[PDB]
Design an enzyme around this catalytic site. Structure first.
Site, PDB file in Angstrom:
ATOM      1  N   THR A   1      21.390 -34.589  61.486  1.00 35.79           N
ATOM      2  CA  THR A   1      20.412 -35.255  60.405  1.00 35.79           C
ATOM      3  C   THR A   1      21.099 -36.511  59.465  1.00 35.79           C
ATOM      4  OG1 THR A   1      21.190 -33.815  58.696  1.00 35.79           O
ATOM      5  CG2 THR A   1      20.087 -32.665  59.806  1.00 35.79           C
ATOM      6  N   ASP A   2      22.184 -36.199  59.998  1.00 35.41           N
ATOM      7  CA  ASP A   2      23.506 -37.485  58.508  1.00 35.41           C
ATOM      8  C   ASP A   2      22.181 -38.862  59.327  1.00 35.41           C
ATOM      9  OD1 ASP A   2      25.850 -38.090  57.182  1.00 35.41           O
ATOM     10  OD2 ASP A   2      25.705 -39.787  59.073  1.00 35.41           O
TER      11      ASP A   2
ATOM     12  N   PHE B   1     -20.933 -24.177  33.858  1.00 35.07           N
ATOM     13  CA  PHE B   1     -20.915 -23.023  34.632  1.00 35.07           C
ATOM     14  C   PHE B   1     -21.535 -21.498  34.075  1.00 35.07           C
ATOM     15  CE2 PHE B   1     -17.623 -19.378  36.696  1.00 35.07           C
ATOM     16  CZ  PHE B   1     -18.470 -20.089  38.338  1.00 35.07           C
TER      17      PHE B   1
ATOM     18  N   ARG C   1     -18.552 -27.298  28.316  1.00 36.04           N
ATOM     19  CA  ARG C   1     -17.003 -26.855  28.294  1.00 36.04           C
ATOM     20  C   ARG C   1     -16.349 -27.681  29.025  1.00 36.04           C
ATOM     21  NH1 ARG C   1     -15.784 -23.873  34.271  1.00 36.04           N
ATOM     22  NH2 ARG C   1     -16.691 -25.668  35.836  1.00 36.04           N
TER      23      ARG C   1
ATOM     24  N   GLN D   1     -16.285 -26.506  42.549  1.00 35.02           N
ATOM     25  CA  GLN D   1     -17.305 -26.166  43.553  1.00 35.02           C
ATOM     26  C   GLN D   1     -18.086 -27.726  43.871  1.00 35.02           C
ATOM     27  OE1 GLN D   1     -16.139 -23.879  41.800  1.00 35.02           O
ATOM     28  NE2 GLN D   1     -15.676 -22.231  43.014  1.00 35.02           N
TER      29      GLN D   1
ATOM     30  N   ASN E   1      -8.220 -25.396  38.196  1.00 37.44           N
ATOM     31  CA  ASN E   1      -9.552 -25.735  37.457  1.00 37.44           C
ATOM     32  C   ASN E   1      -8.278 -24.908  36.047  1.00 37.44           C
ATOM     33  OD1 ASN E   1     -11.129 -25.071  35.074  1.00 37.44           O
ATOM     34  ND2 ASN E   1     -12.469 -23.201  36.399  1.00 37.44           N
TER      35      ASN E   1
ATOM     36  N   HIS F   1      -7.320 -23.957  32.390  1.00 39.25           N
ATOM     37  CA  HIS F   1      -8.970 -23.353  30.748  1.00 39.25           C
ATOM     38  C   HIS F   1      -8.248 -24.060  29.864  1.00 39.25           C
ATOM     39  CE1 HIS F   1     -10.778 -21.583  34.498  1.00 39.25           C
ATOM     40  NE2 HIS F   1      -9.093 -20.438  34.984  1.00 39.25           N
TER      41      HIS F   1
END
Ligand SMILES: O=c1[nH]c(=O)c2nn[nH]c2[nH]1
Ligand SMILES: O=c1[nH]c(=O)c2nn[nH]c2[nH]1
Ligand SMILES: O=c1[nH]c(=O)c2nn[nH]c2[nH]1
Ligand SMILES: O=c1[nH]c(=O)c2nn[nH]c2[nH]1
Ligand code: NA
Ligand code: NA
Ligand code: NA
Ligand code: NA
Lengths: 295, 295, 295, 295
Positions: free
Chosen positions: C57-58, C159, C176, C228, C254, C256
């Site tokens: 990985t090095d 909503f 809202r 949606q 969402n 609130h």
């Protein structure tokens, strides 16, 4: 304009050290994060671009590793004092060093009920910290602390008889959840220098252990009238058990767990004596602080 | 355009529940964070602004609290299955529920060597998790996991004999530090429904405990040839001990601790056999994954 | 037991590159975090401790820096494709490379209304990301995304008309606050290899800009019937404007903001039409997802 | 034992407020996180379980919302002063209020080159903060700050001529990257009370804007000899432009970007004048502080 105060150095220096017992094969690891800030006759680096007074922060980093190589790193109160003393002795124009150390937990693993020689687990993010201020001609001031200890009790906490006025909606209660993250700091009497710090070395680990124990026992056993009242009891006991501490400070969030009224749904009873399901609140939180000293 | 896939619901719903034994006075607390996402015949809410098909996410939140009030919340595999089944049975047009639960540790305190009836400590940020997918007509798929288990061993790890080419600078080693955060997931055979999940209830806690134990023991005892080789040994043993698991997945960061050459400073020896002080590296890190199943 | 799936590599590789225009003196900086995971004939490293199959990985880390030195790093879709192709061509036994890149914003500063040649500001934590999967014999699959774009509108969100049953407490609303963090992903048609990716290079930056613009405009202008409905409108427009995209996915929390009833205090009116002060909620949150493709 | 110091209150109170212009239809939003801690004659709540002296932290939370409902919330220096004054005037035994406010950015969106009436974007995590200490009989002390402003310049930074000794490995440089997160605080002259704060209201927003502008311009234009020298220039200019400021404090991390030597790979040149690809370092970091006042 004039420079009123200045300090500079290296933050977030992560250090690991291993000790290997050749006889027994047992290895012990320490891991810390260190910050060192220096003060002294360094104003001209700000005002005249005179870098000649600057011990480079990269050199401070090197110094931390070299000092860890050549000295014990535990207890952190001793290591911080060695490190801070180094800078004020080595550099004529540096007159104060401020060393902060955070110790990370690496707890030896038990495998099949026996301690493993070289394997460790991070059991919790609880930290043991020190702040060491080494000031030329004024000795060594050390504040030790534990932080990130999170506890909860599900009963035996009350809160009633507080001030009620036109801003108050909170109902009095005789049975609530109490949960907090504990930050506790004890400040040592001033030490004259490294020799004196060395003479008290066994007290550092012992006092940390005592502070932790007193915190946990008092929290678990107190039929708490308030966070204020319970925290005072903790601080009182620590001061009683270690004469070399001058003050104890606690800073405690009160992490709220709210009842949920479910009666709108088929008369379901979930408040007061019937409360079983609660909504932990991420914010806001109470924050309660106290510093307790000697009469 | 067309809706190819859709799911919606409520995330980060924190829930606490307490059980009170009236006889013994002992209280036991559970705290979880829950996410529920639903799928079904809900396309028109996206395409035609038809909200009539939407079970409001606020209602999903209410449902989680109500379900916790009326059912046991442990083991989480059972609770998640009850919760997911609820939505597919209650709502004709909802055909899949996806429930994720993270369980937070509240460990009973020992005060003076005895278990306290109502006081708890968060010992580590290690989590026990479940993912439950309840799909109408296709049963219940459960993946259980532990995460946030951080371990280190200071010796008995090697890494040599890897591919060397013109991109390689890494030196082979026969003695290094190995440290990782363990994420392990075991996937259960598909269950036909809630009755079958209930019939296997004792296996859930037992298998979690076994997975944890095997992970810790293997890590501590393996003279590790690589992360790859050690993790395979873990997965092998878990599959051997629980026939109802189909696959085990491990995802392991390799958190590097680098030697620090101090020889530039007064010939100080701090590499190879003389290495005592190391620099933990926050990034980059190796990331090694494997999924092991049955022959 | 058998290895069912395996991948390994290097995560959290931070890279900065500067381009210096000699003619104009103007400098442009790029900063990224890169993860590369490889798959192939590497099972024996897990099962037999055979490290001979492991590209360390090095070395992967070295390769990322070398590739950045020798190639443009923008657009990230091209850089990721070059990097992934490298591994499958260089190593016979490596058959898939998975490259994830996060691009960090460094925006040129305007000082006195003119663009500065070499000074930059991080304006927001919004990211531009790519996921590139290069699979030998199956071409190059690219998913591009933006994430961490946080927006709020204070009105013109509604909503109402959702399902109401015995689990519902939420009141319908015609006005809202709507606030979300946008995560949007567009998936490109499969490319046959690097030549084809190169042929489409101008489309990558253009499509990112278009996706951002469509997201912001639609959010600001839609009199939103639900998250949606608004998100579907976004996805629709992106697919219309770029024929080489096959699917668009949005994942939207969402977040609130709750009204606060203050009427208990001197009849203070702070709800409905009188709502001025709100309590943002850190949790729980709605989570709404959709994947939109072509008819 | 005795109570040496005590303060308590509510932290992490998130508040949003909207202003609606009826004439123009334009809406403007403000979002803040507020902490209020009180001091006074409250020792007995700690020492005697006397809750009668406690203004409940829940009431403090209510007070913050009520005060936001009835007063402007901008500039935050004014809002904090109103809020703090409230507690010392309302409660005889409360003698100091400490109010901390963090203001979050909600920047009006431009859609098609025109400002949108009600849609906002979080452009960066940069904050505007205030700390207001209202002490009965001693007036109002206000510290204003900006934080989380992250900048980078790719050239026109130097660092040479620092102290070199046996701890030093750092090479002198005449061309390096400089990057930092800016934390700047300006402390106002003490105000006698709310009337005086009100009389200076226009200066608060203006001084914040000036501090930001001076910071950005100086950073971009200074051919920097060190972080120390550049930060001093900033502080000097702020003090020159606003006589009502007594001190300016800057605290600046020096976030390092290291050259990567690639010469081991095919003689690739990537250092000094040839440096194009760098490795940003997450830690450690320099930390440089200064407080500048008037002669
Ligand atoms: O600007 C700088 N100031 C310093 O004090 C320092 N120390 N190392 N590098 C540095 N750069
Ligand atoms: O836009 C929304 N979509 C939803 O699904 C929802 N559920 N509760 N509130 C909501 N708002
Ligand atoms: O255990 C390891 N596995 C690897 O794949 C690797 N690559 N570099 N170092 C390593 N260590
Ligand atoms: O223990 C408490 N202390 C307080 O000051 C407080 N205020 N509200 N609830 C409270 N609980
Ligand atoms: Na000195
Ligand atoms: Na159904
Ligand atoms: Na290949
Ligand atoms: Na008062």
């Amino acid at each position: 304009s004039a420079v009123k105060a200045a300090r500079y150095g290296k933050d977030n220096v992560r250090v690991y050290k291993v000790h290997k017992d050749e006889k027994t094969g047992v290895q012990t690891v320490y891991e810390m994060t260190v910050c060192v800030l220096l003060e002294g006759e360094i104003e001209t680096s700000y005002t005249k671009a005179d870098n000649s007074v600057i011990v480079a922060t990269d050199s401070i980093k090197n110094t931390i590793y070299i000092t860890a190589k050549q000295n014990p790193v535990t207890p952190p109160e001793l290591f911080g004092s060695i490190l801070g003393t180094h800078f004020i002795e080595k550099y004529n124009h540096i007159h104060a060093a401020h060393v902060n150390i955070v110790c990370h937990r690496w707890t030896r693993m038990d495998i099949d009920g026996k301690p493993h020689p070289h394997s460790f687990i991070r059991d919790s993010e609880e930290k043991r910290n020190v702040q060491v201020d080494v000031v030329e001609g004024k000795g060594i001031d050390i504040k030790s602390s534990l932080s990130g200890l999170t506890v909860l009790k599900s009963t035996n906490s009350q809160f009633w008889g507080f001030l009620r006025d036109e801003y108050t909606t909170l109902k009095e209660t005789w049975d609530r959840i109490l949960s907090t993250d504990v930050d506790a700091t004890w400040q040592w009497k001033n030490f004259s220098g490294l020799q004196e710090v060395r003479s008290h070395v066994p007290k550092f680990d012992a006092t940390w252990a005592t502070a932790r124990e007193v915190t946990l026992k008092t929290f678990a056993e107190d039929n708490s009238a308030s966070v204020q009242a319970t925290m005072y009891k903790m601080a009182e006991q620590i001061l009683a058990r270690q004469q070399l501490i001058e003050t104890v400070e606690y800073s405690l969030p009160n992490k709220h767990y709210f009842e949920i009224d479910l009666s709108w749904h088929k008369g379901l009873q979930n408040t007061g004596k019937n409360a079983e399901v609660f909504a932990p609140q991420s914010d806001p939180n109470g924050l309660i602080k106290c510093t307790v000293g000697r009469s």
